[PDB]
Design a protein around this ligand. Structure first.
Ligand SMILES: Nc1nc2c(ncn2[C@@H]2O[C@H](COP(=O)(O)OP(=O)(O)O)[C@@H](O)[C@H]2O)c(=O)[nH]1
Ligand SMILES: [Mg+2]
Length: 167
């Protein structure tokens, strides 16, 4: 019987949650994916030569029953922001407190994902900024890009699973 890791992809709208999720599950880049669907994805994944089932909810939207459950029984979270969106970085703390509130814990597995690093000519959030925010929350930091050709999409999800397994 394989373990099932339930993960939640959270972040402001337009940071690339859907694109990163589609790139991880379907291995294609879908630009301008409709911003409103909040769906979940399920597939068998091999991480560190150990197979597992990944139940990932791509968040969107007020209140949602599906979002509510996945936040409660989730095992790990992906706090995603866009390096071109300063407000998406400003809400990293807000998303950090919501997870710790929903889970009612002082620390829970999460990784800080800085998306859209392919747009270097439009980058507003720096690597030192993301590293400092990650160091403050004591969580891993990684830079991703869902646009073709992708960068670190699998590693972002795999590193969260590694954090879950190490606890
Ligand atoms: N350049 C670049 N654009 C991206 C990337 N990820 C998403 N986008 C674009 O950003 C827009 C919003 O992305 P989306 O996946 O809908 O973000 P979401 O609303 O949080 O799910 C889309 O038009 C995408 O084409 C990326 O890694 N690089
Ligand atoms: Mg989306």
């Amino acid at each position: 019987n394989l373990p099932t890791y339930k993960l939640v992809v959270v972040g402001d709208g337009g940071v690339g949650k859907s694109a990163l999720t589609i790139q991880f599950f379907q291995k294609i880049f879908v630009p301008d994916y409709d911003p409103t669907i909040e769906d979940s994805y399920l597939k068998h994944t091999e991480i560190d030569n150990q197979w597992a089932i990944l139940d990932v909810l791509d968040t969107a939207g007020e209140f949602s029953a599906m979002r509510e459950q996945y936040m409660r029984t989730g095992d790990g979270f992906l706090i995603v922001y866009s390096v071109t969106d300063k407000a998406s970085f400003e809400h990293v703390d807000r998303f950090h407190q919501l997870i710790l509130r929903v889970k009612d814990r002082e620390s829970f597995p999460m990784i800080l994902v800085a998306n859209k690093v392919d747009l270097m000519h439009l980058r507003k959030i720096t690597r030192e900024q993301g590293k400092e925010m990650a160091t403050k929350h004591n969580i891993p930091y990684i830079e991703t890009s869902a646009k073709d050709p992708p960068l670190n999409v699998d590693k972002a999800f795999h590193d969260l699973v590694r954090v879950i397994r190490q606890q």
